[PDB]
Amino acid sequence: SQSNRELVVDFLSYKLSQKGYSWSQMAAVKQALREAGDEFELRYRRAFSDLTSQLHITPGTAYQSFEQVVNELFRDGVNWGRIVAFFSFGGALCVESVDKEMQVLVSRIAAWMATYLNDHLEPWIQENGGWDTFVELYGNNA
Amino acid sequence: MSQSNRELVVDFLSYKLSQKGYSWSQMAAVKQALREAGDEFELRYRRAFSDLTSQLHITPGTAYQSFEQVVNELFRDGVNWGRIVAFFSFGGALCVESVDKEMQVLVSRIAAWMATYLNDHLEPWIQENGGWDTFVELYGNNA
Amino acid sequence: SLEIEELARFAVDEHNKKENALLEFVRVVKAKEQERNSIFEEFTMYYLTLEAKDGGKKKLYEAKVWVKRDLVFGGPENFKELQEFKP
Amino acid sequence: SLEIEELARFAVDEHNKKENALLEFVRVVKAKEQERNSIFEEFTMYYLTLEAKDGGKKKLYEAKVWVKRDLVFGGPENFKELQEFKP
């Protein structure tokens, strides 16, 4: 019923997205960031391999180790491209974790990513017009 | 802090996992299977589906009864997973047609109509046929 | 193996109807099936080698028969179709 | 202006390297620039008209030079490439 509403909204959001429309501004941001991640992983296959190889997450990995490697993306400053790289980095660490039957780490990586956004990126995002601006600069919307 | 940033993290991780055949959650697996089924339906039944969509053009005047009457055709011979997918695809087509006519306000009404139709006419069959988890095992592309 | 014989009979009977021919079904020599059953459609393709008499003379024929049901817009009815029939 | 001069000088050098030629840069006569960019990459595209000496005689040449920047991993040190060079 509430699950049935959630399926209807997800499906309609997808069908609108396929034509360049969006359910909501949040749906448009989710779609733009999904697409941007795929483009990033295509364009930066080799350089991205170099970044993921620097952190093999185990149950004993501390946030501080993730924070130090992520900081490398942002040493020259924050921009939307580097924020996309940061999301792709998190996604690759999750996939790697599941591949190794260390599913326990997916929830932890999500928490780390939210910590890193709060601490390092959100001030820049809010003074640069928010995710609404990202969709304006990257989204393929009608 | 930011609940929007948390939602974008979860959405992006759900997507990346799904691309490798993994699922954030059982709900994420149901959503992905229905997205894929809707795509397959629209490719296979392009011609017959166009005969269904042509029967209803929604305007501010259109009552739920007119929507119900057309969707009722779909399920005349009974409910099955393929017809449920068609139902979702029909609603998707009505939402795209609405936005094409600069009437996005109708999208929320169509979503409400679809949720009403599901709970009223389809949920009893879904529950006695093993629910959406049955749909995923059968149809899902999962690792 | 019994329901294969009915499809082979159908292939001969369908070939005779369509080509104004009088081939006489003797038996199924061999049969292969490939299937695609989804939430949308039931599809079986049968490759039958059969023996039939053409003016009393037994000869070998291969027939391709398709059986389909559309689970979305179709009836309870299946649909048999002869695709190919050659010696 | 000095950045335009560098790109004109690069265009002549790259032409001479590619075509075993000896054109001598004199000056830039006009420069147009367009920008193409995504969140990952910046292109600044220069349409240069330049004067160069061919065997000591001044002639006009059109060059197209691209300056590319990787916005994710790149440094300040950009990448020049010569796309076209014609009299």
Numbering used by the authors:
A (entry chain B): 2 to 143
B (entry chain A): 1 to 143
C (entry chain D), D (entry chain C): 4 to 90
Q: How did the manuscript describe this experimental structure?
A:
In all cases binding between BCL‐2 family members occurs through the BH3 homology domain of one protein, which forms an α‐helix upon binding and docks into a complementary cleft on its partner. We have used phage display to isolate Affimer reagents (non‐antibody‐binding proteins based on a conserved scaffold) to identify ligands for MCL‐1, BCL‐xL, BCL‐2, BAK and BAX, then used multiple biophysical characterisation methods to probe the interactions. Co‐crystal structures reveal an unprecedented mode of molecular recognition; where a BH3 helix is normally bound, flexible loops from the Affimer dock into the BH3 binding cleft.
BCL‐xL‐AF10 showed problems during purification so was not further characterised. Both BCL‐xL‐AF6 (IC50=448±53 nM) and BCL‐xL‐AF7 (IC50=393 ±54 nM) were shown to act as sub μM inhibitors of the BCL‐xL/BAK interaction but were ineffective in inhibiting the MCL‐1/NOXA−B interaction. In the case of BCL‐xL‐AF6 a particularly strong enthalpic contribution was observed. For BCL‐xL‐AF6/BCL‐xL, the crystals diffracted to 1.91 Å, and the asymmetric unit contains one domain swapped dimer of BCL‐xL, with one BCL‐xL‐AF6 bound to the cleft of each monomer. The residues within the VRs of both Affimers interact with residues lining the BH3‐binding cleft on the surface of BCL‐xL. On inspection it is apparent that the Affimers select a distinct conformation of the BCL‐xL domain. The binding groove on BCL‐xL is formed by helices 3 and 4 and helix 3 is mobile such that the width of the groove can vary. When BH3 peptide is bound, helix 3 moves to accommodate the peptide in a relatively wide groove (groove open conformation). When bound to BAK peptide the groove is 14.8 Å wide at the widest point, whereas in the small molecule and Affimer bound conformation it is ∼11.0 Å wide. In this case, not only does the Affimer bound conformation correspond to a small molecule bound conformation (thus this might conceptually be a better starting point for structure based drug design), but the groove closed conformation is also a conformation where the groove is too narrow to accommodate the BH3 helix, possibly potentiating the orthosteric competitive effect.
